[PDB]
Amino acid sequence: ADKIKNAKIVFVVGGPGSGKGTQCEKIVAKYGYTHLSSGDLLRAEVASGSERGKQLQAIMQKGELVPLDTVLDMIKDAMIAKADVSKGYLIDGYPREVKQGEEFEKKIGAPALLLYIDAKGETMVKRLMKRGETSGRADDNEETIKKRLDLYYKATEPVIAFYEQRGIVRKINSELPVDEVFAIVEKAIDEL
Ligand SMILES: Nc1ncnc2c1ncn2[C@@H]1O[C@H](COP(=O)(O)OP(=O)(O)OP(=O)(O)OP(=O)(O)OP(=O)(O)OC[C@H]2O[C@@H](n3cnc4c(N)ncnc43)[C@H](O)[C@@H]2O)[C@@H](O)[C@H]1O
């Protein structure tokens, strides 16, 4: 526990399809951070066949936010499972609300960096549609896209302004080619 609490922790925040997972995989290979995706954890619980998984599946297929306690407990347990060995943690897709950040800080520890993966709204819509047309997830349909984006703009963008009060946000232009985005992310990571 005091081990995870004192670890470097990076929050990765950005709209659906903005390129969070993409950039996080490149961080892992280059710097050796531990990548925890809130969405991957939740989808793994869905695939387990549990009753909790059936309810998560419903929530996610509607594009809605899973309750804080559910996602936070999964993230904590996944941090613990990898605590022995981390150079640091990339928490991808959490927090999605201010209260999510605040509870993570109370239970786990503070973020040193918030990578704000910043894509245009229409770029996200097009990206999520392109994925949807070629083997996307079940939530990559048009109607669910609308709800995922709405919640990002209303609930999640406030997270940026929140952690901007402590100067830890770095804005990453995720409209550039993947490798050019990564060069900006490297600049941010090297500050740690
Ligand atoms: N904290 C939380 N609290 C409550 N509920 C939660 C929660 N976390 C999750 N949930 C629930 O789970 C759901 C799923 O959430 P989750 O899976 O966490 O998040 P997401 O934002 O929906 O995941 P995406 O995979 O759509 O986006 P990504 O930004 O990682 O993009 P990627 O790199 O793949 O890239 C997308 C596409 O774009 C392309 N691309 C990426 N970067 C670039 C680039 N620079 N140039 C060109 N194309 C690019 C990629 O090839 C790819 O095709 C939520 O809606 C909610 O229901």
Numbering used by the authors: 2 to 193
Question: Anything the authors wrote about it?
Answer:
AK is a small enzyme that catalyzes a reversible phosphoryl transfer reaction between ATP/AMP and two ADPs. The structures comprised the characteristic three-domain arrangement: the CORE (residues 1–38, 69–136, and 143–193), AMPbind (residues 39–68), and LID (residues 137–142) domains. The static CORE domain provides substrate-binding sites, and the dynamic AMPbind and LID domains close over the AMP and ATP sites, respectively, upon substrate binding. AK is a small protein that undergoes relatively large conformational changes upon substrate binding and product release, and has long been used as a model system for studying connections between structure, function, and dynamics.
Among the tropical AKs, AKDr was the most thermally stable. The three AKs from the tropical fishes including AKDr have Ile28, Ala48, and Lys188 at these positions, whereas AKNc has Val28, Ser48, and Thr188. In the structure of AKDr, the longer side chain of Ile28 enhances the hydrophobic contacts with the residues in β3 and α9, and interacts more closely with hydrophobic residues in β1 and β4. At these positions, AKXm and AKPr also have Val residues, but AKDr, which is the most thermally stable of the three tropical AKs, has Ile residues. In the crystal structure of AKDr, Ile118 and Ile173 improve CORE packing cooperatively by increasing hydrophobic interactions between them as well as with other residues. The reverse triple mutation significantly reduced the thermal stability of AKDr, as indicated by a decrease in Tm of 8.9 °C relative to the WT enzyme, confirming the importance of the CORE packing in the overall stability of the fish AKs. The AKDr mutant exhibited increased catalytic activities at low temperatures (5 °C and 35 °C) compared to the WT enzyme, and the temperature of maximum activity decreased (35 °C). In the crystal structure of AKDr, we identified a salt bridge connecting between Arg171 and Glu192, which is substituted to Ala192 in AKNc.
